[PDB]
């Protein structure tokens, strides 16, 4: 378990609005935020809180740095035969779709800038090498979104899929469609796809929107085997049905080091359990002012999922 | 009755050649006479080459001249495990083969230059090595430890912690010769600021001379090898006195040469004159091997002596009543036909474990720490089988030496 | 032991012709005849640079990459370009042209493996084999291209042995060449990644260090060039002599590196004094520690004195004191403690062999790795930038069958090497 945070610039409304920038980023895995508070008399002051992540990034960093530090690493985890989730957590307009969908303030665009093409972009390199061609491994990919306990594929028209777990308490989303990729563009059409068909609101203004848990995961099946080879799933969560899934997949997370259910955490529950299986979270931080009580809540929140390690 | 040598390391093996040089010109085996009695290692050929290409060339058995073309690398890792290992069998065998021959030994008397690659790393296997194959035997190693302002390579820390933990529990005597304070006496008591290492090598090839050779040599107060290590360790730790000479007289400035005992004994315990930078600076002395050679009386020893036990100035330690062993050799000392040690008709080769070193190891552990701090040179060990065990551990190995050269004295 | 140097692209190239002018010369070695050694010393260790087959031909083991054939034409139909065998010409007489992608993707990757081919056959020569020499400049498609792709494959072939990497960083006031940046960033990503040794020479360091350190008021390249090679024959085959004190490529490298990049230095000649006056003989040792120790006579571009040092290297090379020299090292790290970096008691690394450069009484290279060099990568880094916001001449790499994120990545690893660096100026 790694766990990131991630602070985004301040975007143009927010300068404009001249919102004031309360988080620092001073070293590689120290975010301090200066939260502003008032005494009862109203005196101003600092408190300004310290935070220690695996790796803390700064507005100046860039998707492709922040995947090699997130993302990257567990790639491998599942040529080794693993299963392999990475998270991005976080407010609102935090950065979240961003990262993993593709550079876009409105959280849609550019595929190819995103995590999620930039984890397919890997595998294929990997595929190739010497120690895995042996392997003759198929990549195939999915896509779907988790909305009021409901999974609808993303790839085949937003089809309500159904999903039932075993006695034995396996869970398969029945439905769901795998879709075979032999090229990183093909994998960014796939992710076109699915984001034009992402839940949202009405056409916003501007921005996309979470109320859904976005999940594009990359399977790799030579005729099975543990079920497939490996499997690595990415997750765009709401913003933080939505509490009760948060909370759970904390517990999830938490108990992977050891080893009150939602539908997120039931159809991931196969990544948690299994001993060769790692996961990632990044938490995304909105520096404004107006955002310090949401970035407390995600950062606390942050702090409990790594305390696990 | 015997004692064989091995001298580990570029170094060990230039103080070597000296060493060995000043033997047979006074022993009257020249270039080709008999046959050693010793081995050279190195893993860097270019300068065992040096003893196969210079001097005192065909007075060795290339047997006894061991080399590994391979690379010497200045840290103690890759001298020790990775690379050093291949060699060591191959070594041990010679100290086993040139042990063999000879008839009831005594120990042997190994040359190496604590800092270094080969010097540091092998060694510490080698005597390692030893202790086991012979514990019963005497394990006196000569070193030549990091120079306290003026030190070489920029880890020699990492090198030095490294092998007098391993070699700690090994050792007999260690014999300690600083570079440094060597220069000071060829500044200070001889006048040069031209001293070629090849100078440092003929001083230390004095000193020594008169451990061994004299030493195991006939004279009206004899002193075994064993002797030494029972007359000077108080303790199980491979405790290491000092090395200091008397008449360090220039053989062309001054001359006063004829300096009565009573002189030549008080010049050794003025600090400048040690072969050390470990100047007296509260360090009690706990025991001294008087080692003298040339004419001298025994009473003026006994009187000399007694002069000195009674400086207090001069503070022994506690539970020492009398710690003088007082070793005397007839043959006088003998020196380079032209180099530049005076050459007198006596001197005073007195080598001490004093509560001294409290600080020159202080002082080279602290260098440690500070890089270790920052792991500054480690991957070079690491990456060469060694762990973050190895060092931390070996840390905490020389802090209690750090303790124990403090409680065996300051304390009564 | 032995090494095979690289003349990648035209420069790496036509220093090539001036790293073996001399080279050969520091060891007697003319045109296609043997070995006329003043000595008998600059012999017993040439293998490093050679190969046995006749008895009197000796042949350069190195090899000579370059999609471009006039050039190695120009090096081959010269002076001492007759000794290297034609086995180890190997041209692509393709279009060399000036696209770090036309040489390390599309025109490039195919005349590799008919190099790889030969390296092997050089590697696989006798002996043991230490490492690899990389000349070539990263502003051009057969320089930083193909040339960092030739290490790419070296690099995965023996780990083990080690390799230098002569680069000829873009020069700051004026490009000799327009995409620069590109062609270069893209290079000292791969050497950031393979090489373990770096050693950056900039044209202009070197007029101004031959103009000014060289009354030389006509400094062609051939000189620049010459410079440059006395440095890297005080480097390697130097240390392949005899030394009170000797080192080699990797003490070098075991003693130079802290920290995994691969780190680059900053490579400095001692005696570097003009013909006939100068000739002041000012040479007893304080004066070499003066020169390579200044500013000004750092071939790189940036000034030390701009940012702490992590190591040095000062390997000289003639008959001196392991006391005058052991010794000044020291005033000299104490003059200036300010910079020198303090996480490490001992920065220096004095080296000494014995014979000195042929004609000299006392010389000693310096090899710096100082945290200067960040200031450099900082440049090349932000030319990038500046450019590649409007894509300039990128239609000549993608063209070419490049990628966006491929530029992406390098200016970003490179651009992160440079904060690295400064980890340690502090």
């Known amino acids: 378990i790694t766990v990131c945070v991630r602070k985004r610039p301040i975007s143009r409304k927010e300068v404009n609005r001249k919102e004031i920038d309360v988080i620092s980023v001073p070293r590689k895995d120290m975010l301090i935020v200066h939260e502003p508070r008032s005494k009862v008399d109203l005196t101003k002051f600092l408190e300004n809180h310290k935070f220690r992540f695996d790796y803390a990034f700064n507005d100046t960093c860039d998707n492709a740095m922040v995947y090699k530090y997130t993302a990257k690493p567990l790639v491998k985890t599942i040529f080794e035969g693993g299963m392999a989730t990475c998270f991005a957590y976080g407010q609102t307009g935090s950065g979240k779709t961003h990262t993993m969908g593709g550079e876009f303030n409105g959280k849609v665009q550019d595929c190819k800038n995103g995590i999620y093409a930039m984890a397919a972009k890997d595998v294929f390199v990997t595929l190739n090498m010497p120690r895995y061609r042996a392997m003759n491994l198929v990549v195939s990919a999915s896509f779907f979104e988790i909305y009021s306990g409901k999974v609808f594929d993303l790839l085949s028209d937003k089809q309500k899929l159904r999903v039932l777990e075993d006695g034995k308490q396996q869970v398969q989303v029945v439905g769901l469609t795998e879709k075979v990729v032999d090229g990183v563009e093909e994998v960014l059409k796939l992710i076109q796809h699915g984001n034009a068909a992402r839940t949202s609101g009405q056409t916003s203004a501007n921005s996309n929107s979470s109320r859904s848990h976005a999940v594009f995961q990359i399977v790799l099946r030579p005729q099975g085997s543990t079920k497939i080879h490996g499997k690595f799933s990415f997750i765009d969560l709401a913003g933080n049905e939505i509490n009760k899934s948060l909370l759970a997949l904390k517990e999830c997370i938490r108990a992977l080091g050891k080893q009150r259910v939602s539908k997120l955490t039931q159809v991931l529950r196969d990544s948690f359990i299994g001993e060769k299986s790692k996961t990632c979270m990044i938490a995304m931080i909105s520096p404004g002012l107006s955002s310090c009580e949401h970035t407390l809540n995600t950062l606390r929140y942050a702090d409990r999922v790594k305390e696990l390690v | 009755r015997e004692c064989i040598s091995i001298h580990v390391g570029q170094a060990g093996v230039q103080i070597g050649n000296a060493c060995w040089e000043l033997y047979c010109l006074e022993h009257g085996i020249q270039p080709d006479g008999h046959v050693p009695r010793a081995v050279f290692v190195d893993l860097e050929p270019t300068v065992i080459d040096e003893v196969r290409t210079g001097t005192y060339r065909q007075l060795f058995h290339p047997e006894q001249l061991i080399t590994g073309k391979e690379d010497a690398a200045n840290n103690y890792a890759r001298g020790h495990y990775t690379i050093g290992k291949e060699i060591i069998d191959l070594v041990l065998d010679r100290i086993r083969k040139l042990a063999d021959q000879c008839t009831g030994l005594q120990g042997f008397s190994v040359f190496h230059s604590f800092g270094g690659g080969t010097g540091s790393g092998f060694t510490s296997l080698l005597m390692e090595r030893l202790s086991v194959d012979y514990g019963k035997k005497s394990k006196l190693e000569f070193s030549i430890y990091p120079a306290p302002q003026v030190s070489t390579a920029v880890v020699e820390p990492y090198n030095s912690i490294l092998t007098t933990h391993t070699t700690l529990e090994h050792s007999d005597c260690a014999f300690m010769v600083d570079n440094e304070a060597i220069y000071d006496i060829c500044r200070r008591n001889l006048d040069i600021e031209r001293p070629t290492y090849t100078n440092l090598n003929r001083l230390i090839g004095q000193i020594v001379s008169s451990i061994t050779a004299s030493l195991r040599f006939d004279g009206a107060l004899n002193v075994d090898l064993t002797e030494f290590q029972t007359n000077l360790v108080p303790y199980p730790r491979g405790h290491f006195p000092l090395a200091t000479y008397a008449p360090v007289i220039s053989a062309e400035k001054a001359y006063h040469e004829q300096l009565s005992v009573a002189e030549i004994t008080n010049a050794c315990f003025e600090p400048a004159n040690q072969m050390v930078k470990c100047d007296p600076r509260h360090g009690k002395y706990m025991a001294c091997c008087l080692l003298y050679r040339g004419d001298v009386v025994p009473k003026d020893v006994n009187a000399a002596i007694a002069t000195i036990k009674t400086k207090r100035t001069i503070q022994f330690v506690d539970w020492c009543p009398t710690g003088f062993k007082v070793g005397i050799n007839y043959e006088p000392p003998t020196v380079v036909p032209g180099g530049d040690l005076a050459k007198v008709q006596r001197a005073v080769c007195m080598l001490s474990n004093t509560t001294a070193i409290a600080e020159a190891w202080a002082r080279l552990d602290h260098k440690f720490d500070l890089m270790y701090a920052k792991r500054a040179f480690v991957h070079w060990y690491v990456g060469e089988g060694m762990e973050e065990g190895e060092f931390s551990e070996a840390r905490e190995d020389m802090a209690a030496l750090e303790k124990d050269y403090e409680e065996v004295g300051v304390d009564s | ?426």
Request: charged content about 20%; some cysteine.
């Open chain 3, 1 to 426: 032991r032995e090494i095979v140097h690289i003349q990648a692209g035209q420069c790496g190239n036509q220093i090539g012709a001036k790293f073996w002018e001399v080279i050969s010369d520091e060891h007697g070695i003319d045109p296609t005849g043997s070995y006329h050694g003043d000595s008998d010393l600059q012999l017993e260790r040439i293998n490093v640079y050679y190969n046995e087959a006749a008895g009197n031909k000796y042949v350069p083991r190195a090899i000579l990459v370059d999609l471009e054939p006039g050039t190695m034409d120009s090096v081959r139909s010269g002076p001492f370009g007759q000794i290297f065998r034609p086995d180890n010409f190997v041209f692509g007489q393709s279009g060399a042209g000036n696209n770090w992608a036309k040489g390390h993707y599309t025109e490039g990757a195919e005349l590799v493996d008919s190099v790889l081919d030969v390296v092997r056959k050089e590697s696989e020569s006798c002996d043991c084999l230490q490492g690899f020499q990389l000349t070539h400049s990263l502003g051009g498609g057969t320089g930083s291209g193909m040339g960092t792709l030739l290490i790419s494959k070296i690099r995965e072939e023996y780990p083990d042995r080690i390799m230098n990497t002569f680069s000829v960083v873009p020069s700051p006031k004026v490009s000799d060449t327009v995409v620069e940046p590109y062609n270069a960033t893209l290079s000292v990503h791969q050497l950031v990644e393979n090489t373990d040794e770096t050693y950056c020479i900039d044209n202009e360091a070197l007029y101004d260090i031959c103009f000014r350190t060289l009354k030389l008021t006509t400094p062609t390249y051939g000189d620049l060039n010459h410079l440059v090679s006395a440095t890297m024959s005080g480097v390697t085959t130097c240390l392949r002599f005899p030394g009170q004190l000797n080192a080699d490529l990797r003490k070098l490298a075991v003693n130079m590196v802290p920290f995994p990049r691969l780190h680059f230095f900053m490579p400095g000649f001692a005696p570097l004094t003009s013909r006939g006056s100068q000739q002041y003989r000012a040479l007893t040792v304080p004066e070499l520690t003066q020169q390579m120790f200044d500013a000004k006579n750092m071939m790189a571009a940036c000034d030390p004195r701009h940012g702490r040092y992590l190591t040095v290297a000062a390997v000289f090379r003639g008959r001196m004191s392991m006391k005058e020299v052991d010794e000044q090292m020291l005033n000299v790290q104490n003059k200036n403690s300010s910079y020198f970096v303090e996480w490490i008691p001992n920065n220096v690394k004095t080296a000494v062999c014995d014979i000195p450069p042929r004609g000299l009484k006392m010389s000693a290279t310096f090899i710096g790795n100082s945290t200067a060099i960040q200031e450099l990568f900082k440049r090349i880094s932000e030319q990038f930038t500046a450019m590649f916001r409007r894509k300039a001449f990128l239609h000549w790499y993608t063209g070419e069958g490049m990628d966006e994120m491929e530029f992406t990545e390098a200016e970003s690893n490179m651009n992160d090497l440079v904060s690295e660096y400064q980890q340690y100026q502090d």
